[PDB]
């Protein structure tokens, strides 16, 4: 199936049971979510974006259910303005950018 | 053809003759480039990203040559850390995100 890019490519995912609407971003290397708690087993991280950078908590082998699949992967939490799934999860989902 | 997302989806584009390497970003609504000059007929703009926001100069109907096509479209210039083509140009290029 495919997303055509006239509207934002947003889907609902479940991160450890929690429903979250995420933007599928090919220019994000990482996926960073807010408003979910995944606990104390994290390594701290800083990721940069357009206007500067943010403090994140990187979690490993989190389970994500999205577009019919359950995959486990790396989620960060931090004060992102919008939740994004970057290429680490999109490669896990077999997504490609076609033309 | 397609980009698989294990490496960043980077291509070379020519913006009014100038060669620039750009990241194709499905989570950018706009395309913002640096290190090119497109002149004085612009409207100023502020776009937000992950860490905050930036001042940009929005140019209309600029000509872009990329992946075998010449299209004219809206380019912004500002202090972006990496040059991005967002969904305004990717829809013009018939790109979709497939899975």
């Amino acid at each position: 199936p495919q997303f055509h890019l006239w509207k934002r490519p947003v889907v609902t995912a479940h991160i450890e049971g929690q429903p979250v609407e995420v933007l599928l971003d090919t220019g994000a290397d990482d996926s960073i979510v807010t408003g979910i708690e995944l606990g104390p087993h994290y390594t701290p991280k800083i990721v940069g974006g357009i206007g500067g950078f943010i403090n994140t908590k990187e979690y490993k082998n989190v389970e994500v259910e999205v577009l019919g699949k359950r995959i486990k992967g790396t989620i960060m939490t931090g004060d992102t303005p919008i939740n994004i799934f970057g290429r680490n999860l999109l490669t896990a989902l077999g997504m490609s950018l076609n033309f | 053809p397609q980009f698989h997302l294990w490496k960043r989806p980077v291509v070379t584009a020519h913006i009014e003759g100038q060669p620039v390497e750009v990241l194709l970003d499905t989570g950018a609504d706009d395309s913002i480039v640096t290190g090119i000059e497109l002149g004085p007929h612009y409207t100023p703009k502020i776009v937000g990203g992950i860490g905050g926001f930036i001042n940009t100069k929005e140019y209309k109907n600029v000509e872009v040559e990329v992946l075998g096509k010449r299209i004219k479209g809206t380019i912004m210039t500002g202090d972006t850390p990496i040059n991005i083509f967002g969904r305004n140009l990717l829809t013009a290029l018939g790109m979709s995100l497939n899975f």
Binding site: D25, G27, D29, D30, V47, G48, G49, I50 | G27, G49
Partner: peptide
């Protein structure tokens, strides 16, 4: 877009 984001990276480190």
């Amino acid at each position: 877009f984001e990276a480190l």
